[PDB]
Amino acid sequence: MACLSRIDANLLQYYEKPEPNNTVDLYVSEYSNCLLLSNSEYICYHFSSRSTLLTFYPLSDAYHGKTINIHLPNASMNQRYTLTIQEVEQQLLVNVILKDGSFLTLQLPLSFLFSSANTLNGEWFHLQNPYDFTVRVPHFLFYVSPQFSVVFLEDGGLLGLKKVDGVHYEPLLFNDNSYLKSLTRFFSRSSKSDYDSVISCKLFHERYLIVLTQNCHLKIWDLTSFTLIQDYDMVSQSDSDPSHFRKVEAVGEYLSLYNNTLVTLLPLENGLFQMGTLLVDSSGILTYTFQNNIPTNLSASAIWSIVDLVLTRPLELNVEASYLNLIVLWKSGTASKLQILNVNDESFKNYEWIESVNKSLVDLQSEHDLDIVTKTGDVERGFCNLKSRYGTQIFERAQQILSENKIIMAHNEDEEYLANLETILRDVKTAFNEASSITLYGDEIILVNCFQPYNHSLYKLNTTVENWFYNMHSETDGSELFKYLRTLNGFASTLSNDVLRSISKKFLDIITGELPDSMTTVEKFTDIFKNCLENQFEITNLKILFDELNSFDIPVVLNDLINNQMKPGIFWKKDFISAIKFDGFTSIISLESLHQLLSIHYRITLQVLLTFVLFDLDTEIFGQHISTLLDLHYKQFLLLNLYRQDKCLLAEVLLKDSSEFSFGVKFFNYGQLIAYIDSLNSNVYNASITENSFFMTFFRSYIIENTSHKNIRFFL
Numbered sequence: 001m002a003c004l005s006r007i008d009a010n011l012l013q014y015y016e017k018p019e020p021n022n023t024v025d026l027y028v029s030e031y032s033n034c035l036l037l038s039n040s041e042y043i044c045y046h047f048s049s050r051s052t053l054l055t056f057y058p059l060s061d062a063y064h065g066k067t068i069n070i071h072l073p074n075a076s077m078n079q080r081y082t083l084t085i086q087e088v089e090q091q092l093l094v095n096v097i098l099k100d101g102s103f104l105t106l107q108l109p110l111s112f113l114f115s116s117a118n119t120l121n122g123e124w125f126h127l128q129n130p131y132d133f134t135v136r137v138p139h140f141l142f143y144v145s146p147q148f149s150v151v152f153l154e155d156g157g158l159l160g161l162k163k164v165d166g167v168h169y170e171p172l173l174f175n176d177n178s179y180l181k182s183l184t185r186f187f188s189r190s191s192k193s194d195y196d197s198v199i200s201c202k203l204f205h206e207r208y209l210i211v212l213t214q215n216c217h218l219k220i221w222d223l224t225s226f227t228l229i230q231d232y233d234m235v236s237q238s239d240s241d242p243s244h245f246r247k248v249e250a251v252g253e254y255l256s257l258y259n260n261t262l263v264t265l266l267p268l269e270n271g272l273f274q275m276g277t278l279l280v281d282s283s284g285i286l287t288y289t290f291q292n293n294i295p296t297n298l299s300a301s302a303i304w305s306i307v308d309l310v311l312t313r314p315l316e317l318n319v320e321a322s323y324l325n326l327i328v329l330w331k332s333g334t335a336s337k338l339q340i341l342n343v344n345d346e347s348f349k350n351y352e353w354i355e356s357v358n359k360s361l362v363d364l365q366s367e368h369d370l371d372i373v374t375k376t377g378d379v380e381r382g383f384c385n386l387k388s389r390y391g392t393q394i395f396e397r398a399q400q401i402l403s404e405n406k407i408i409m410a411h412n413e414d415e416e417y418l419a420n421l422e423t424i425l426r427d428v429k430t431a432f433n434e435a436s437s438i439t440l441y442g443d444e445i446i447l448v449n450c451f452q453p454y455n456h457s458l459y460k461l462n463t464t465v466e467n468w469f470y471n472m473h474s475e476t477d478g479s480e481l482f483k484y485l486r487t488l489n490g491f492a493s494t495l496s497n498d499v500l501r502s503i504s505k506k507f508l509d510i511i512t513g514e515l516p517d518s519m520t521t522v523e524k525f526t527d528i529f530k531n532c533l534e535n536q537f538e539i540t541n542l543k544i545l546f547d548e549l550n551s552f553d554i555p556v557v558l559n560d561l562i563n564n565q566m567k568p569g570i571f572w573k574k575d576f577i578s579a580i581k582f583d584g585f586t587s588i589i590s591l592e593s594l595h596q597l598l599s600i601h602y603r604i605t606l607q608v609l610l611t612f613v614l615f616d617l618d619t620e621i622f623g624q625h626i627s628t629l630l631d632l633h634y635k636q637f638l639l640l641n642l643y644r645q646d647k648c649l650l651a652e653v654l655l656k657d658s659s660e661f662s663f664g665v666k667f668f669n670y671g672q673l674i675a676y677i678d679s680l681n682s683n684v685y686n687a688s689i690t691e692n693s694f695f696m697t698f699f700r701s702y703i704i705e706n707t708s709h710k711n712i713r714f715f716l
Contacts, residue, residue, distance in 0.1 A: 010391030156195025
């Protein structure tokens with residue numbers, strides 16, 4: 001099998017505008033996330049510009065709710081992990097520690113986030129001070145419960161802030177403040193030892209707060225009486241290599257807790273996953289039980305540092321045996337490596353590392369299907385194609401870089417300006433899509449929210465056809481059919497990609513009658529040979545091909561291809577839950593997931609039909625199969641042409657036919673996501689050649705109602 005491929009996405013690729021038409025500036029990425037509420041609406045927030053910008057936008061399009069930019073007067077006072085955002089009492093509670101000694105409370109009514117009909121000025125902020133934070137240093141903020149937070153200090157000490165009136169905080173002192181957390185020991189290369197500079201914590205039973213300090217001693221404090229109950233020295237000189245060691249002093253995630261299973265990262269080696277169970281023993285004392293330790297060896301050049309770690313339920317992301325998946329986001333430099341330690345069993349001793357394959361739609365299309373932008377002739381066409389592939393945010397930013405570095409724009413005349421642009425569109429999209437954080441979208445599907453607002457990269461599960469395709473770059477086989485397709489790929493890597501598309505073009509004419517349907521199909525295949533394969537074909541490969549054909553039964557292989565490998569699953573409305581609102585994020589990714597799949601089929605269909613062009617063979621029994629592949633070839637190619645015409649209008653027709661509601665959907669499970677793509681794919685193949693649902697919409701919108709010459713011209 002293969003591995004998870006991501007999808008690049010922008011929410012400003014649907015809109016030809018730079019920025020939301022509904023925005024408001026209010027005035028009182030480091031981390032970003034998206035929070036599912038019990039309203040069942042996703043609201044996204046990003047924390048960027050070195051703590052001087054909170055960006056809230058609904059993840060349901062920022063042009064049907066108000067963008068609210070809450071511009072902070074000050075940057076945060078040590079760390080960018082002194083932010084907690086959770087929904088409290090049907091108001092979105094935002095807590096911010098600021099550099100001036102204040103504690104910021106914002107109350108954003110849910111109505112103001114998701115309606116654009118709502119501007120609000122006044123009663124959206126209250127700034128008040130529990131204890132001056134320009135004195136003793138906060139480095140961590142944790143929201144504990146719905147009326148309790150603990151702000152952990154860098155010189156040790158626990159300060160609870162208790163909630164009054166559903167908004168404001170009043171300080172409640174605990175007796176455990178530093179001065180004497182340094183009078184019960186000595187030490188001389190240490191000073192963090194009994195100071196509670198807690199770098200990660202998670203709360204079990206809403207009673208006991210399991211805290212990891214800088215030293216990564218796991219200390220369990222029952223905070224329903226503010227007593228230390230248990231102390232485990234976790235660091236060891238034989239569960240880990242002490243020669244290899246790196247300091248961790250930065251607030252992030254080093255404890256992960258899902259169900260009662262805890263994961264502790266030990267800063268000895270280049271990480272240790274120590275797996276244990278949290279169980280309460282008699283006398284109401286939570287005890288930690290070691291189970292197993294897994295050593296590991298990384299590979300850097302400036303030391304991999306973790307970002308986040310999230311223990312969750314079994315994920316289907318090209319696994320083979322699973323009990324739990326521990327997602328790990330490493331970053332050193334501008335490389336992020338997403339890898340997933342899949343533990344397959346309860347022992348935790350059989351594991352595999354499932355790697356992330358970080359190839360979008362963009363990379364596979366640049367690698368193979370290179371003539372598609374400004375390489376299809378017409379500079380006017382090239383220019384629109386650049387817009388559609390990389391959104392408004394990248395597009396406008398690219399104009400800025402052009403002005404600094406002085407490039408004279410000669411758009412719509414010179415092919416070479418489009419190449420210059422194309423390069424920039426790429427460097428700016430990569431910077432914008434870099435990893436910041438993990439968010440679980442729907443509590444399963446691994447979403448990386450990225451630097452700068454309105455940027456996300458979702459990863460998807462590859463289906464049987466998709467797994468095979470990456471296993472032709474490994475040349476892995478496993479049926480009679482799989483072997484046939486692998487041979488055909490060998491021959492096609494020798495032909496230029498330009499010839500492969502010329503042969504695709506002539507197969508299309510057979511369905512359109514632009515090559516007459518007055519010939520036998522065999523004569524038309526002869527036309528193809530002479531025009532496209534002369535002085536390109538390898539003589540060697542023709543014979544190898546003949547030997548494979550003699551070993552594998554033809555009609556059998558062709559039925560198998562058509563009915564199980566190109567065609568999608570049979571799933572319809574009932575397999576998926578339908579949303580009660582519009583959502584942009586889901587409809588975009590579905591489009592692109594459908595698109596990807598059909599691009600591989602477009603090439604498969606090409607490669608199989610080619611054999612009939614090489615040799616002069618009877619197609620009186622195989623004629624029935626052949627007709628299907630020309631039909632399938634058609635539909636696959638058609639969608640591609642339309643996507644360049646305009647990808648947004650093409651999504652709108654599609655969403656209606658699938659959805660009960662029409663427009664948008666929500667996903668919370670991998671089965672659901674899959675079914676919905678399969679339902680769209682079915683709908684396309686159920687369409688006729690003569691009238692398409694797309695053809696009708698696109699024509700009416702541009703051509704009849706009348707729009708400027710650019711939409712008329714590529715539509716031609």
